[PDB]
Each structure stands twice: as C-alpha cells, then as structure tokens.
Amino acid sequence: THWGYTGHDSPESWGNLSEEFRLCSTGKNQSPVNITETVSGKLPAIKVNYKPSMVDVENNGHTIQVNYPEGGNTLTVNGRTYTLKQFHFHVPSENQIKGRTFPMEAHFVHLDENKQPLVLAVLYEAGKTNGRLSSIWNVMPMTAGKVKLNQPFDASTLLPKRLKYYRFAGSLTTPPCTEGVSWLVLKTYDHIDQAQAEKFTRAVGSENNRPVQPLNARVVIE
Amino acid sequence: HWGYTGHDSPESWGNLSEEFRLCSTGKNQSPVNITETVSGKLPAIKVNYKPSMVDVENNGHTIQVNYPEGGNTLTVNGRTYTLKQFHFHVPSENQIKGRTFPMEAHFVHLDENKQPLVLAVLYEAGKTNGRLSSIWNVMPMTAGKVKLNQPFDASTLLPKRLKYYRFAGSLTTPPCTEGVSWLVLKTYDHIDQAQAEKFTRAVGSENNRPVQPLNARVVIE
Numbered sequence: 236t237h238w239g240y241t242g243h244d245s246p247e248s249w250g251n252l253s254e255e256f257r258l259c260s261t262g263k264n265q266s267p268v269n270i271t272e273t274v275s276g277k278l279p280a281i282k283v284n285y286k287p288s289m290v291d292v293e294n295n296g297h298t299i300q301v302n303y304p305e306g307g308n309t310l311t312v313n314g315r316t317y318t319l320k321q322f323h324f325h326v327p328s329e330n331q332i333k334g335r336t337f338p339m340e341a342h343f344v345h346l347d348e349n350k351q352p353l354v355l356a357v358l359y360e361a362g363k364t365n366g367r368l369s370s371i372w373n374v375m376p377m378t379a380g381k382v383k384l385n386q387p388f389d390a391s392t393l394l395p396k397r398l399k400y401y402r403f404a405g406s407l408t409t410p411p412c413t414e415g416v417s418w419l420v421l422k423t424y425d426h427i428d429q430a431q432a433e434k435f436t437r438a439v440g441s442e443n444n445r446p447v448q449p450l451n452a453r454v455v456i457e
Numbered sequence: 458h459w460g461y462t463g464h465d466s467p468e469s470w471g472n473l474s475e476e477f478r479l480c481s482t483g484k485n486q487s488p489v490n491i492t493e494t495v496s497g498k499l500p501a502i503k504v505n506y507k508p509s510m511v512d513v514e515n516n517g518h519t520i521q522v523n524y525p526e527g528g529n530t531l532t533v534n535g536r537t538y539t540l541k542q543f544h545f546h547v548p549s550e551n552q553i554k555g556r557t558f559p560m561e562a563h564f565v566h567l568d569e570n571k572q573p574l575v576l577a578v579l580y581e582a583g584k585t586n587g588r589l590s591s592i593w594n595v596m597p598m599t600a601g602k603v604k605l606n607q608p609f610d611a612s613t614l615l616p617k618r619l620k621y622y623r624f625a626g627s628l629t630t631p632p633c634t635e636g637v638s639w640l641v642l643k644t645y646d647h648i649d650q651a652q653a654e655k656f657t658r659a660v661g662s663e664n665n666r667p668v669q670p671l672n673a674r675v676v677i678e
C-alpha cells in the first residue's frame with residue numbers, strides 16, 4: 236500500500252494501512268531511537284571492504300537510494316561478512332543522540348548469506364559542503380526514477396576515519412518495519428551544507444524521518 | 458418491504474408479514490434501555506480486526522460496510538466469531554439510563570454454527586470523527602454498492618478499553634430473529650452534527666427501532 240510521512244499516510248498510520256505493516260505499530264524492537272543511556276562494552280571491530288563499483292542512483296518517492304546490482308562491497312563484524320545492497324538518506328536524521336536531531340543521516344543496508352540485515356548509520360553535522368556526495372547529488376533524479384551512474388562509485392569515501400559505533404537491535408524504519416535488524420551507528424559524524432540537505436528534500440518532496448521509537452527492553456552498547 | 462416511517466413502521470412490523478411475527482410476539486427483543494444491571498465477572502473480549510478490502514452499501518435502511526472475505530474475528534470464551542458487516546443507526550437504538558445517543562454502530566458476527574453476535578458502539582456528540590471519514594466520503598446517497606478501493610481497518614473504530622454490557626436479544630430489523638448475543642461497549646466514541654445529519658440524508662430517515670422491555674432478562678456488566 237501507499238505510505239508516506241505526511242497526510243493520512245504518516246508513520247502513525249502505517250500499521251492500519253495493510254496487515255503486512257502490522258509490526259510497525261505492534262513491534263517492541265522498532266527503529267529509529269533516541270540514544271541517551273548506554274552500556275560501555277568491548278565491541279568488536281568493523282572491517283569494511285568497499286570498492287569503486289557500477290551503481291545506479293534512484294528516486295523511489297521515499298528517498299534517494301544508491302543501488303548495488305552486484306556484490307563485492309562488504310562489511311565484516313565478529314566473523315560474519317555482510318554484503319552492501321544499497322544505501323540511502325534521511326533529512327533530517329531518524330536516530331537521535333541525546334535528543335539531538337541531525338541535518339542528515341545515511342543508511343548502508345547490508346545482508347549476510349542467511350539474508351540477515353545489518354544497517355550501518357552515518358550522521359551528518361551542519362557545516363562545510365561535502366564534495367564526496369557531489370557525484371550523487373548532481374545526478375539526483377528530481378522525480379521518481381532511476382539514473383545509471385556513468386562513473387564507478389566508491390562508498391569507502393562516505394565513511395569516517397574512526398569506526399567506533401553504537402550497537403543495538405531494531406528494525407527497518409520503513410514499512411513493513413521488519414525486526415531482527417542489527418544496527419551500528421557510527422560515533423564520528425560527517426558533514427553537509429544546508430543547501431545539500433535542501434536539494435534532497437526538494438527531490439523527495441518532504442522530510443522523510445520516522446519518529447523515534449521506545450527502547451523498551453533494549454540496551455544500547457557503545 | 459418495511460421501514461421506519463409510513464405505514465410500515467417498527468410498531469407495525471409484525472403485522473406486515475407472517476415472517477415478521479416475532480417482531481411483535483418476541484419476549485427477548487432488541488434494542489433495550491439499560492437501566493438496572495447485575496455486576497458480574499464477564500470474560501475479556503479478544504478482537505482481531507485488520508486492514509481489509511470492503512464494500513460500502515446503502516440498502517435503504519442503513520449504510521453498511523460488507524466483508525466478503527474472512528479474517529476479521531472476535532473471540533469470547535474460546536468461541537470465535539467472524540465479522541460479516543457493520544452498520545449504523547441515527548439516532549442510537551439502545552439507550553443507557555434513558556439516554557439516546559447521536560449514533561450507534563453494530564458489528565455483526567457469526568460463528569461456525571451461524572450463531573449471531575452483535576458488538577455495539579455508542580457515539581457522543583463531539584469533535585469530527587476522522588476514522589469514519591473514508592467511509593463517509595464514498596457513502597452512496599442512493600441505494601447502491603460501492604467498493605472502497607483503499608483497505609479499511611475496523612480496529613480503528615474500537616476504543617482501547619473493551620468493557621461491555623452483556624444480554625441476550627434479537628436483530629433490531631425484521632424478521633427480528635432471537636438468539637442474538639449482544640455486547641454493548643461501555644466506552645463511547647464520538648461524531649459531530651454534520652456527520653450524523655449526512656447519514657440521515659443518504660438513508661432518508663432516522664433508522665432506530667424503539668426500545669423493547671427486558672422482561673425476564675438481566676443485563677450483566
């Protein structure tokens with residue numbers, strides 16, 4: 236069913252749209268969340284192996300998504316290898332750190348061999364222009380459609396130096412709100428100019444952040 | 458052929474057809490005016506309604522939302538009833554201590570053995586009911602059936618607290634069949650004047666049957 240962020244299709248109503256979106260309102264391990272209290276722990280290191288690839292940018296009406304038709308771009312964590320399937324954006328951010336909403340947030344969606352999803356999240360602070368995002372921003376479809384990127388894109392450039400992260404379990408922030416998703420939110424933020432965030436919104440048609448959900452029985456580790 | 462006005466009013470139903478004789482001779486007729494009750498430990502209601510493809514119908518006596526497919530159920534005491542349809546009455550048919558409400562909704566269920574169960578929701582005059590808007594928008598003004606294209610979840614029409622009044626009754630329209638389980642929710646929902654009047658206009662008149670004596674029945678709450 237059609238769903239959105241405004242009108243009668245807003246996040247508060249996703250569960251009433253179709254029986255398949257039921258977990259959006261009944262789930263107890265939903266995303267995004269407001270990270271306030273955390274438990275300090277010895278978290279395992281992240282091994283990222285991204286390479287210049289043949290990707291295609293897409294405007295699906297909900298976000299601007301960069302699709303990877305093939306494998307080869309991976310993330311290894313605690314012995315398990317996850318393959319990057321796609322990455323997209325949210326303006327403003329969905330997850331919050333101590334009540335702070337960020338200008339933008341990127342979600343790098345991965346899937347392991349058993350099809351278990353893992354999302355790596357990057358938060359952006361308001362500031363200097365990001366040239367690393369220009370290659371995608373300049374070809375950004377202003378309307379619903381896909382555009383093949385002529386030059387190979389290297390997602391490695393979109394990741395910080397230090398890969399320390401916050402770890403918790405959650406779900407997809409969009410319908411059907413499937414749970415069983417591991418979330419790794421990077422502690423080191425990147426940046427964007429207020430104008431970059433603005434062009435995004437204009438292309439999508441509205442802010443596309445889902446409101447924060449209750450942590451419930453969950454503990455966030457840092 | 459029956460109605461609420463003209464020569465075929467509720468008070469005459471039993472006289473207009475041998476098939477409608479129970480409307481005048483029944484001792485366990487609905488609706489009723491709930492005044493005196495017996496406090497008892499009633500079983501909790503388990504409602505399992507979901508977004509479904511339904512059709513809206515103006516049959517000349519009410520505005521009805523039909524469910525051709527199964528999947529929407531109500532469970533009480535291990536028994537499971539499947540929602541067949543829900544309709545409305547303006548003003549309400551049942552009363553609580555002499556009080557008639559602006560509107561009343563009837564959710565008609567049937568179990569494996571075709572035993573009818575009616576869940577009733579009463580509405581007070583208040584703010585605009587936005588959860589009824591979708592149905593109200595496509596509401597056929599003339600006798601006819603229209604298939605609501607977007608899915609409708611009847612759970613949005615029910616309050617969080619499901620306490621209810623329990624008594625046995627009948628259908629409130631001919632042939633006034635008895636053996637009907639009635640569960641009237643204690644918590645009220647709301648509608649505005651416009652919505653109520655809009656309903657009367659499409660149906661063509663007030664469609665509430667006058668209250669019937671309880672006789673040997675007792676209402677439990």
Ligand SMILES: [Zn+2]
Nearest residue numbers: 323325342408
């Ligand atoms: Zn996302």
Ligand SMILES: [Zn+2]
Nearest residue numbers: 544546563629
């Ligand atoms: Zn009725």
